Design an enzyme around this catalytic site. Sequence first.
Site, PDB file in Angstrom:
ATOM      1  N   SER A 240     -36.301  10.113   3.299  1.00  0.00           N
ATOM      2  CA  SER A 240     -34.857  10.304   3.350  1.00  0.00           C
ATOM      3  C   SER A 240     -34.485  11.242   4.490  1.00  0.00           C
ATOM      4  O   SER A 240     -33.389  11.132   5.041  1.00  0.00           O
ATOM      5  CB  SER A 240     -34.265  10.789   2.029  1.00  0.00           C
ATOM      6  OG  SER A 240     -33.814   9.697   1.239  1.00  0.00           O
ATOM      7  N   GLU A 356     -29.289   9.576  -2.351  1.00  0.00           N
ATOM      8  CA  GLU A 356     -29.269  10.597  -1.316  1.00  0.00           C
ATOM      9  C   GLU A 356     -28.530  10.120  -0.068  1.00  0.00           C
ATOM     10  O   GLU A 356     -27.737  10.857   0.509  1.00  0.00           O
ATOM     11  CB  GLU A 356     -30.701  10.976  -0.975  1.00  0.00           C
ATOM     12  CG  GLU A 356     -31.328  11.828  -2.069  1.00  0.00           C
ATOM     13  CD  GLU A 356     -32.777  12.155  -1.770  1.00  0.00           C
ATOM     14  OE1 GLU A 356     -33.269  13.075  -2.461  1.00  0.00           O
ATOM     15  OE2 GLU A 356     -33.402  11.517  -0.893  1.00  0.00           O
TER      16      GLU A 356
HETATM   17  C1  HEM Z   1     -34.680   5.462   1.663  1.00  0.00           C
HETATM   18  C2  HEM Z   1     -35.878   6.020   1.594  1.00  0.00           C
HETATM   19  C3  HEM Z   1     -37.100   5.280   1.241  1.00  0.00           C
HETATM   20  C4  HEM Z   1     -37.634   4.164   1.808  1.00  0.00           C
HETATM   21  C5  HEM Z   1     -37.078   3.359   2.948  1.00  0.00           C
HETATM   22  C6  HEM Z   1     -38.828   3.872   1.111  1.00  0.00           C
HETATM   23  C7  HEM Z   1     -39.623   2.776   1.448  1.00  0.00           C
HETATM   24  C8  HEM Z   1     -40.726   2.409   0.714  1.00  0.00           C
HETATM   25  C9  HEM Z   1     -41.472   1.235   0.900  1.00  0.00           C
HETATM   26  C10 HEM Z   1     -41.226   0.169   1.928  1.00  0.00           C
HETATM   27  C11 HEM Z   1     -42.469   1.234  -0.010  1.00  0.00           C
HETATM   28  C12 HEM Z   1     -43.501   0.152  -0.179  1.00  0.00           C
HETATM   29  C13 HEM Z   1     -44.800   0.452   0.562  1.00  0.00           C
HETATM   30  C14 HEM Z   1     -45.771  -0.682   0.354  1.00  0.00           C
HETATM   31  O1  HEM Z   1     -45.698  -1.413  -0.648  1.00  0.00           O
HETATM   32  O2  HEM Z   1     -46.667  -0.900   1.185  1.00  0.00           O
HETATM   33  C15 HEM Z   1     -42.348   2.403  -0.773  1.00  0.00           C
HETATM   34  C16 HEM Z   1     -43.190   2.741  -1.795  1.00  0.00           C
HETATM   35  C17 HEM Z   1     -43.106   3.984  -2.391  1.00  0.00           C
HETATM   36  N1  HEM Z   1     -42.158   4.918  -2.254  1.00  0.00           N
HETATM   37 FE1  HEM Z   1     -40.656   4.793  -1.164  1.00  0.00          FE
HETATM   38  N2  HEM Z   1     -39.027   4.775   0.151  1.00  0.00           N
HETATM   39  C18 HEM Z   1     -38.030   5.664   0.168  1.00  0.00           C
HETATM   40  C19 HEM Z   1     -37.810   6.773  -0.637  1.00  0.00           C
HETATM   41  C20 HEM Z   1     -38.748   7.224  -1.545  1.00  0.00           C
HETATM   42  C21 HEM Z   1     -38.582   8.310  -2.397  1.00  0.00           C
HETATM   43  C22 HEM Z   1     -37.339   9.164  -2.432  1.00  0.00           C
HETATM   44  C23 HEM Z   1     -39.746   8.412  -3.144  1.00  0.00           C
HETATM   45  C24 HEM Z   1     -40.125   9.383  -4.185  1.00  0.00           C
HETATM   46  C25 HEM Z   1     -39.255   9.943  -5.006  1.00  0.00           C
HETATM   47  C26 HEM Z   1     -40.599   7.372  -2.728  1.00  0.00           C
HETATM   48  C27 HEM Z   1     -41.847   7.149  -3.236  1.00  0.00           C
HETATM   49  C28 HEM Z   1     -42.505   5.948  -3.030  1.00  0.00           C
HETATM   50  C29 HEM Z   1     -43.753   5.659  -3.720  1.00  0.00           C
HETATM   51  C30 HEM Z   1     -44.478   6.564  -4.676  1.00  0.00           C
HETATM   52  C31 HEM Z   1     -44.129   4.441  -3.325  1.00  0.00           C
HETATM   53  C32 HEM Z   1     -45.356   3.697  -3.768  1.00  0.00           C
HETATM   54  C33 HEM Z   1     -44.986   2.877  -5.003  1.00  0.00           C
HETATM   55  C34 HEM Z   1     -46.202   2.254  -5.625  1.00  0.00           C
HETATM   56  O3  HEM Z   1     -47.267   2.167  -4.994  1.00  0.00           O
HETATM   57  O4  HEM Z   1     -46.145   1.816  -6.786  1.00  0.00           O
HETATM   58  N3  HEM Z   1     -39.968   6.670  -1.753  1.00  0.00           N
HETATM   59  N4  HEM Z   1     -41.274   3.117  -0.313  1.00  0.00           N
END
Ligand code: HEM
Length: 398
Positions: A240, A356
């Site tokens: 973010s 956010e």
């Molecule tokens: C706008 C902001 C965000 C974007 C663009 C974003 C983007 C992504 C994307 C594309 C993935 C998939 C990755 C994959 O499968 O290879 C992902 C997974 C993840 N994101 Fe986000 N994310 C954001 C915000 C957040 C926030 C705020 C958190 C934590 C509170 C977070 C925690 C995670 C976690 C833990 C994963 C892995 C989920 C899993 O493996 O089950 N992300 N995110």
Amino acid sequence: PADAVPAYPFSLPHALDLDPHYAELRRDEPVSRVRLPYGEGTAWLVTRMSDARIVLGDSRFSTAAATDPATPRMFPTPPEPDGVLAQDPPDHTRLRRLVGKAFTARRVEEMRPRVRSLVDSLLDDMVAHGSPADLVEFLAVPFPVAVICELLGVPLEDRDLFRTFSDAMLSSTRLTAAEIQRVQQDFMVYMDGLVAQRRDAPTEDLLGALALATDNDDHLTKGEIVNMGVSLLIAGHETSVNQITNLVHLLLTERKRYESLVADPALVPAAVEEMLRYTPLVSAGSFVRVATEDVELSTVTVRAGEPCVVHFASANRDEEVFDHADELDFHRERNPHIAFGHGAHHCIGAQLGRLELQEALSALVRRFPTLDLAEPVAGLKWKQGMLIRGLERQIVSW
Ligand code: HEM
Ligand SMILES: C[C@]12CC[C@H]3[C@@H](CCC4=CC(=O)CC[C@@]43C)[C@@H]1CC[C@@H]2O
Ligand code: NA
């Protein structure tokens, strides 16, 4: 022979431009062999939305298989096997239930009052400083940090400490494997010490739940639990932080975009969705999925054992899915983007990142109608050598 498979990424990134090769690939070679910067051998790069949904959305692709040090990957160190991304269902499903409740759209929506209060607070401090000011220092960094520290229960006094750690963990080429392995180790012991404090005094926060789980879940390992804490603390601010600066850059460099939100601030949620679509936040590639069985994609059957990598931003420009996909448009009727991924590893923080971004832009467009970039576009300091893109600094006036 020594392969003539192209190196991926194809080029060092420029601001938020997509390399022009992706549109070529989408139209003429949507699944194509590439060599990733680390690991051994080649991988299929997937540039189109339908293929991306299969790779991201099917048990026949495994992220757990990709933990092997020989598997191609976008980052220097081999993936930690206890990391959430490296889990396959149903083990992945059990792991996500550790924390998942706190991230539902319902519980996140309940944070809006607290979150808006914090935004207004930081913009108060910015108005105090006076124009011009660095938006990164007064907004993009402190705001997410505060949200994730409240939710997790990390002390705000540790910002500097865990932001050093997180920056290193998001290295693509900036740091070497050794340096990153050291930081990894230190972050692990740090997180483990945060959770271990709840063992004689539980807290109503996520770290609280993490600590209850190390005692009462004989199916989850302490390594998995602690790594969840580490992952949330990283992604929970680093995404973010970057995306606030990215959205603001898109808004200010064609001011008409910003002006349309100033004129109508209820357009902000839709704009956030469209700028998520358009912004290549993920610099290149993705966590690799390895086929465990032959799988049919649009142009090719991926064989069992073969790795694949999705470019999220390319799928989000697929002309078969979005009309005028190369144009930024806040009045699209349909926006099935995958800025937050898809399938099992669909971003757990998706609702929180949406909240956010909505609260940050909404506050800006309502309070600072006259906001503009107050440094030359030529000199903007884009972060280099990281798995995500964004600005080290963004001086603005109003
Ligand atoms: C706008 C902001 C965000 C974007 C663009 C974003 C983007 C992504 C994307 C594309 C993935 C998939 C990755 C994959 O499968 O290879 C992902 C997974 C993840 N994101 Fe986000 N994310 C954001 C915000 C957040 C926030 C705020 C958190 C934590 C509170 C977070 C925690 C995670 C976690 C833990 C994963 C892995 C989920 C899993 O493996 O089950 N992300 N995110
Ligand atoms: C934080 C994290 C590493 C960095 C990842 C993040 C998911 C979203 C994301 C997309 C990428 O392709 C790499 C960078 C990031 C930002 C991952 C979730 C768990 C893992 O530890
Ligand atoms: Na990977």
